Symmetry: C2
């Protein structure tokens, strides 16, 4: 396995990071709890299992509750692997990552008693279940200096992590091309989603987030969760925000399409595409991410002017803050183990927070090598926001006829995942030839 080579360096890095923080916080070690299955109210059914990000940060075990990692950075990390024995289900770790842990099998969740350290006074519990931690004897639960430290360095992806994210993007792109074909065949939102799921070989709960699969006016809906079962009478626009998972690492890709490939909306999409590519290539070590977000508002304003959506020059559109009506979210975010990855705001290991008139900007941190970003500029026609704009004194400056013409197409978003290197950029998505 070519992943195994990189995974050895991955463990050594996590061990190194663990050594530092437990010595800085005077701890014996850190305990990572994979998590638990949540039971539905008054029912014997369970919610789908979601693994603790801090747990899967160590190893690709993401579908197994009641697992525990005990690490101090010097000894080999101890893996308490849950493996029940009853005829109701079907199951020993055999993959390359197993050899880097001291594995002890747990046949029953409550038996974790005797496998955890006896003196837990200086062992930090990192997990969601504080009452379970209390029942075990842990009193140090999710201490902020430890949380902030790990979250800070999570931004710096190891070579193993980059490999996993490249693979995640490979899978996602395959899905996006299948979803694209389904759209031009005139399928419904539901049918398009199904085509995506089949092509990625992902179940719905495997994706890093509930995919957004939108047609026509629904393209304006940022968090569009529902899928229409019936195809629209006329096909105008298509927006799919969908990703994939590989070993716990996420991909997050958006593409917008015009059905006919010509007309005002098709040109608008093409314009946003060139803006999106230009914004991607502005990523560089030393740059604050906030500068890119600002440049995006500049480009959205320019776009509004050129297509005569707003009857003003680009800079007055910026100054009046009209751009926020059409582009109300952030340009992008860190991505990795979590979709919206941690540490996006922090300036140091101690958790120095850097804030963004742009409340929904998710990244303000200085860009460095081995960090991974999304770049997702957008231009939408949302009724609530357009109504607010009409209530302002900027009413007279808006081409409402133009807005009416473009409204049935919903909106535009184009998203890529980019690895920043020392002297180059790696746009994983477009290098996989997703136009």
């Amino acid at each position: 396995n070519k992943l195994a080579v990189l995974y050895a360096e991955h463990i050594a890095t996590l061990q190194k990071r663990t050594r530092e923080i437990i010595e800085r916080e005077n701890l014996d070690g850190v305990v990572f709890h994979s998590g638990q299955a949540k039971r539905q109210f008054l029912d014997d059914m369970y919610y789908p299992f979601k693994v603790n990000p801090q747990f899967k940060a160590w190893l690709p075990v993401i579908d197994n509750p009641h697992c525990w990692i005990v690490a101090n950075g010097t000894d080999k990390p101890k893996l308490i692997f849950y493996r029940p024995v009853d005829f109701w289900h079907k199951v020993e770790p055999n993959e390359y990552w197993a050899d880097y842990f001291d594995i002890e099998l747990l046949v029953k969740p409550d038996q974790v008693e005797k496998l955890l350290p006896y003196d837990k006074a200086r062992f930090a519990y990192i997990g969601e279940y504080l009452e379970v931690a209390q029942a075990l004897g842990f009193e140090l639960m999710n201490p902020e200096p430890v949380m902030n430290f790990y979250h800070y360095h999570r931004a710096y992806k190891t070579q193993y992590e980059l490999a996993c994210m490249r693979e995640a993007n490979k899978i996602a792109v395959q899905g996006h091309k299948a979803a694209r074909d389904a759209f031009f065949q005139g399928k419904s939102e539901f049918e398009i989603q199904q085509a995506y799921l089949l092509a990625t070989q992902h179940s719905e709960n495997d994706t890093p987030f509930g995919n957004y699969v939108a047609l026509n006016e629904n393209c304006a809906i940022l968090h569009y969760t529902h899928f229409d079962r019936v195809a629209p009478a006329t096909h105008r626009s298509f927006l799919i925000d969908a990703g994939a998972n590989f070993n716990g690492y996420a991909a997050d890709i958006t593409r917008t399409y015009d059905f006919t490939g010509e007309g005002e909306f098709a040109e608008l999409v093409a314009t946003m595409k060139q803006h999106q590519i230009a914004l991607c290539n502005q990523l560089a070590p030393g740059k604050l991410y906030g500068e890119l977000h600002l440049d995006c508002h500049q480009r959205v304003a320019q776009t509004l002017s050129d297509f005569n959506i707003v009857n003003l020059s680009a800079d007055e559109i910026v100054a009046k803050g009209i751009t926020s009506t059409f582009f109300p979210h952030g340009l992008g975010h860190h991505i990795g183990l979590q979709l919206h990855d941690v540490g996006g705001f922090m300036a140091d290991e101690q958790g120095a927070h850097q804030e963004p008139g742009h409340p929904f900007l998710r990244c303000t941190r200085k860009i460095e090598a081995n960090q991974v970003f999304t770049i997702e500029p957008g231009l939408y026609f949302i009724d609530s926001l357009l109504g607010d704009l009409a209530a302002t004194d900027n009413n007279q400056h808006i081409n409402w006829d133009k807005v009416a013409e473009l409204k049935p197409f919903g909106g535009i978003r184009i998203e890529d995942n980019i690895i920043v290197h020392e002297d180059s950029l790696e746009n994983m998505t477009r290098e996989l030839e997703l136009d």
Copy 2:
């Protein structure tokens, strides 16, 4: 009758049940909380929303959190319908007219819409702390819970109609899944074919479907989906259902690939046993009586196929049947998959004790009209249970060579959903022509 007509009676029934219990428990009214969405640990993603069964018992609103129902049985039930306004993104169907609807635009503003004096109002929901912080004191009082759960077993005509539709959808799925199997598709592909035909998302189904090929058919709670079709195609077991207005279907079918051979004959024999067991459903009979007969029929099957060298009675007497048939014959089904009240003897909550020999059976309540059951006899070749059998002195009575021949096929389960009427039975599943 159409759903609109039937629903009028449904409300009148719930109103009546409510009047009786608040008078009995000296309450002013009962409050049903739909629930909330659960946020994932250290993340901004949420678990898929699962509605409170007690809430959706009143109306088909199953995807909307922060909803509240205030009822006393005499006045119209008040519905606090959550309808927020954000650019991230009103009831008008037949059921809307039966509620006094008050729109909630933000979840923390609910306090002004709830009763001023909440002392004698019973809170029925999962979020106790939320309720206590609102003023509620009575948290899911057991006499109220028991009362509702007991009468939940008696389905209104509206509820029966919903379940008929749920079964109609599921049957379409099973037919598509069956065809995919004979085409030699993988478990994953079969599941996706099922979802497409039912127009269900993975989280829309009442449970995670069990889609099993060959040896996997022996695993009762088989959750995984193999992405690669087995080199040899021998058997197929799909346990899958559907949802309609919050009401569930629960159907299992088992297939032999070639349609000939010992396993195919075993499937056909189990099918005739299953049909006969369905027809044993009758008002006045304890459900345990049917469970006992199932063990007798499984024993007779084992004997006839010479898997066990004993008569049926001997197989029963030595407790050998439980090796091949380890679970219950079935359960009540409705708003919940394993519906409530199936173990009750009265509305007070007293337990109807299971028949001797099966203390773990939890569907024991005396059968009555307008109740809905599953009938799912099974015969499996499970390694864990067969190992235990080999360790006992009954080892001598087992044709282990035949067991080894049948083991690669996994096991058999056949499940239908049946409505019990006054002097007739309605097998919703087989009425939709699913062999």
